[PDB]
């Protein structure tokens, strides 16, 4: 529709690429309730919604290092969300994210049952801070900020043992980071694309909140995962990976048609109409998906020419098969098995797969899907680019995230792995639009994305 050259879509050459990775790398989620339990139990002070509100005006205007540059730092605010409506209404309407308001009723019910009655605060530090050094000081920045905001708002001295107990209860008791630390070689810290699991990226994008068709939600996570994981963590080489020219969309809609034909409506939403995942079901859907996509390539030679390299043919066949199998069974590892069967069927149909290493994740792919060995077994919702198979080479992880979303979107779940991540990014004041990620890179390749973190005000013209 607004599609442009691949030249101005490379991640350094595209604003929205950078701004959604900046938004993901600057956000942290901090637990708030057991700090209040400390304040109740051994500070002698009764926490009220008025104290909560005053805490929020203290913490939201303290983000630029106040008691940095007021002008530069502006993309900074702390919002709250609770799974307990008893205090969600007395909180000010400018610092609150209602799970009831932003979601449908059953999705909000699942979110509240998952988190219980706890209170959580969503912290976004300035982008300039996350651009200067790595995004591994988001934890420490928000830690010093919420410590200063307890000491300011709730009127304690600095340097007391009860203040120390509150200090540990504030920030390093219940901290939810985007990713965690990294192993030997690529030893980055927290909040990096290596640690950002596939369920996390499924929860970060919010199309599952605002759409009921699981195909669009799955392919949306496929696009966001392809760009983030491949281009940032592993980059490049035909970077526009499976979110242009919509062959993958066509294959996915055909697969949904095939599933709702053969099985009794197994691809629509709802967990009642889900066929149990056996090898026969996976084989059937994965082979039909792959043979359809191969026949589209061999039938339309201009599309075989446009995807010139074998890596993206293999990726768009495997991703379509994987999201298809995940929608049909409700199981994410069924989607992984469909992905790897699509890889093998493509290889035997054409006698050529990819570029030297585009099959590392694939020959030890199908065998590791259902394993329960130590470093070999993991649900696809908990997997990420830190997984041993998926660590180092391009072209794969986007479908891997989209498969997990397709599993937890075919049955109409409220979230893939975290409700904290789902509600945390369910606020429209972000510079990025996580509800529709693949439209924003259309805006970011047409020079219509206006990120923050720029230093134009503090430098000469």
């Amino acid at each position: 529709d607004i599609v442009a050259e691949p030249d101005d879509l490379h991640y350094v050459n595209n604003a929205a690429m950078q701004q959604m990775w900046d938004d993901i790398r600057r956000t942290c989620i901090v637990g708030l309730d057991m700090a209040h339990e400390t304040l109740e139990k051994r500070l002698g002070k009764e926490v009220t919604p008025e104290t909560i509100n005053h805490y929020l005006e203290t913490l939201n205007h303290a983000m630029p290092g106040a008691a940095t540059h007021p002008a530069l730092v502006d993309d900074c605010y702390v919002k709250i969300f609770t799974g307990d409506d008893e205090l969600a209404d007395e909180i000010d309407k400018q610092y609150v994210i209602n799970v009831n308001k932003m979601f449908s009723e059953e999705q909000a019910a699942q979110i509240k049952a998952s988190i219980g009655k706890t209170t959580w605060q969503a912290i976004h530090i300035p982008t300039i801070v996350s651009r200067t050094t790595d995004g591994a000081q988001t934890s420490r920045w928000a830690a010093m900020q919420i410590g200063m905001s307890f000491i300011s708002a709730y009127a304690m001295c600095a340097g007391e043992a009860a203040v120390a107990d509150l200090s540990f209860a504030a920030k390093h008791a219940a901290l939810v980071s985007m990713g965690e630390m990294l192993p030997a070689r690529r030893a980055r810290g927290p909040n990096e694309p290596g640690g950002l699991s596939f369920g996390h990226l499924s929860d970060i994008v919010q199309t599952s909140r605002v759409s009921k068709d699981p195909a669009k939600i799955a392919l949306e996570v496929v696009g966001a995962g392809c760009m983030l994981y491949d281009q940032i963590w592993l980059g490049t080489q035909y970077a526009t990976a499976a979110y242009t020219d919509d062959i993958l969309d066509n294959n996915t809609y055909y697969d949904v048609d095939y599933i709702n034909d053969k099985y009794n409506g197994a691809a629509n939403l709802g967990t009642d109409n889900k066929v149990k995942a056996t090898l026969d079901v996976v084989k059937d859907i994965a082979t039909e998906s792959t043979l359809y996509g191969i026949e589209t390539y061999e039938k339309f030679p201009t599309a075989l020419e446009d995807h010139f390299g074998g890596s993206q043919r293999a990726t768009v066949l495997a991703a379509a098969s994987g999201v298809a199998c995940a929608l049909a069974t409700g199981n994410a590892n069924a989607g992984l098995s469909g992905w790897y069967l699509s890889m093998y069927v493509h290889k035997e149909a054409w006698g050529r797969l990819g570029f030297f290493g585009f099959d590392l994740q694939d020959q030890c792919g199908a065998t590791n899907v259902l394993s329960y060995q130590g470093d070999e077994g993991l649900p696809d919702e908990l997997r990420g680019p830190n997984y041993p198979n998926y660590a180092m080479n391009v072209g794969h992880q986007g479908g891997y995230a989209g498969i997990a979303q397709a599993a937890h979107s075919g049955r109409g779940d409220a979230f893939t792995v975290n409700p904290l991540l789902k509600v945390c990014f369910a606020d429209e004041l972000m510079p990025f639009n996580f509800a529709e990620p693949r439209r924003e890179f259309g805006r970011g390749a047409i020079r219509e994305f206006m990120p923050a973190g720029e230093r134009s005000l503090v430098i000469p013209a």
Partner: protein
């Protein structure tokens, strides 16, 4: 050849004129048994696995895998899971492997064999063998479909291998993962003060013994005690933690009713001068007596013994745990100003006490002192003479903190309570 005499918690004698060398982490068989049982033991909470399987909360904080609930009773038949996991963990029948069930069937205690420790380069193959054995026992007792094997796996292993740690798996050891070490050989000093107070049932100098045991095991592992430094660190072990010559208990029973830090300082400086350890070398014009050290390792041993005695007196008199961050610092500071000598560990104990106070009064709190282990970046600095004091004060607290000893008691204390080398460490030192 120093010949330390060691006496117990109540001050009575245990073994006369033991060699200083025989108390080493590398020679004493008892401390070898503590560190091997630390290496191999791992506790699995079946109630946590059952809640993970039914609810879907597996693999981290806030994570919920919806729709894949695997409803099963794990706590009801925990004996059967116990013999199955004993079958899968063990190398051969009748080896050094014992898994036993906790009250109510809510947990079980896997102890890997000695051979799975000898056959692995590091310590925490026990964690992985125990986690895999529990996972396969769960698979063998469901009859689960293999497309629901990963759910039953990550309910036990957490989010590993995506996370470098297990992170939510109910299989949990005492030491951290070897990638989460601070330096070379700090994996054996990653036991916090709450755990090591819960192990010894909140006895003070039966706790300061344990943390000094672990801390000098860490010092001997890192190569920080070779040659003449080995004598220095080992004499610090003997005098501070292990109650050498009743010194750290004599200071307490002498300065209990009305003593302070300063009376402790006057007491141990009198003891050091009377023992011939410290001499006067040049009396100043104001009547000041500058002092010199005849044997510096033994003087640092008295400074360590005095530091533990002073934190006993100050923290126990206050019945509060937050007083180490003042006591170690100002004790060693007034000791230097009193004698003209260096303090304990030549200023390192005083420095790490400043780090304790900065850590646990304003920012990055770490509980109070209960979350203090020598593996932390702010506690690693001293070569083994501050974390005994911290865990000793945590044993002396009267309930001022909220993260009490009972909070992690079912995690670690009841696990290590049946081991007399863990329960009462001073008397269970022989060789």
């Amino acid at each position: 050849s120093d010949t330390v005499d060691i006496y117990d918690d109540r001050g009575k004698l245990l073994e006369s004129n033991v060699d200083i060398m025989s108390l080493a982490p590398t020679r004493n068989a008892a401390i070898k048994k503590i560190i091997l049982d630390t290496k191999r033991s791992v506790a699995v909470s079946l109630a946590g696995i059952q809640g993970a399987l039914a609810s879907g909360k597996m693999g981290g904080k806030g994570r919920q895998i919806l729709g894949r609930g695997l409803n099963y009773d794990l706590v009801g038949n925990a004996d059967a899971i116990a013999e199955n996991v004993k079958n899968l963990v063990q190398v051969d029948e009748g080896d050094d492997t014992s898994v036993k069930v906790i009250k109510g069937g809510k947990s079980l205690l896997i102890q890997a064999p000695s051979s799975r420790i000898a056959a692995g380069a590091d310590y925490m193959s026990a964690t992985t063998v125990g986690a895999a054995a529990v996972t396969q026992t769960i698979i063998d007792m469901f009859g689960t479909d293999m497309y629901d094997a990963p759910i039953a796996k990550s309910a036990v292993w957490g989010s590993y291998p995506q996370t470098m740690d297990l992170m939510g798996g109910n299989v949990q050891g005492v030491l951290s993962i070897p990638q989460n070490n601070e330096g070379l050989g700090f994996s054996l000093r990653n036991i916090m003060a709450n755990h090591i107070a819960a192990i010894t049932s909140r006895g003070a100098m039966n706790a300061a013994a344990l943390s000094s045991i672990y801390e000098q095991s860490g010092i001997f592992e890192m190569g920080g005690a070779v040659g003449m430094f080995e004598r220095h660190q080992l004499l610090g072990l003997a005098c501070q933690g292990l109650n050498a010559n009743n010194v750290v208990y004599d200071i307490v029973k002498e300065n209990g009713k009305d003593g302070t830090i300063g009376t402790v300082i006057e007491s141990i400086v009198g003891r050091a001068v009377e023992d011939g350890v410290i001499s006067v070398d040049k009396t100043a014009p104001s009547g000041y007596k500058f002092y010199k050290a005849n044997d510096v390792p033994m003087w640092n041993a008295y400074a360590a013994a005095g530091t533990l005695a002073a934190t006993f007196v100050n923290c126990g008199a206050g019945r509060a745990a937050q007083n180490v961050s003042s006591t170690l610092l100002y004790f060693n500071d007034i000791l230097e100003k009193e004698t003209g000598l260096p303090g304990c560990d030549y200023g390192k104990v005083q420095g790490v006490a400043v780090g304790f106070s900065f850590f646990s009064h304003s920012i990055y709190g770490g509980g109070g002192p209960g979350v203090f282990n020598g593996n932390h970046v702010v506690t690693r600095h001293s070569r083994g003479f501050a974390i005994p004091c911290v865990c000793a004060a945590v044993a002396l607290d009267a309930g001022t903190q909220m993260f009490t000893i009972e909070s992690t008691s079912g995690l670690i204390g009841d696990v290590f309570g049946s081991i007399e080398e863990f329960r009462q460490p001073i008397k269970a030192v022989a060789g």
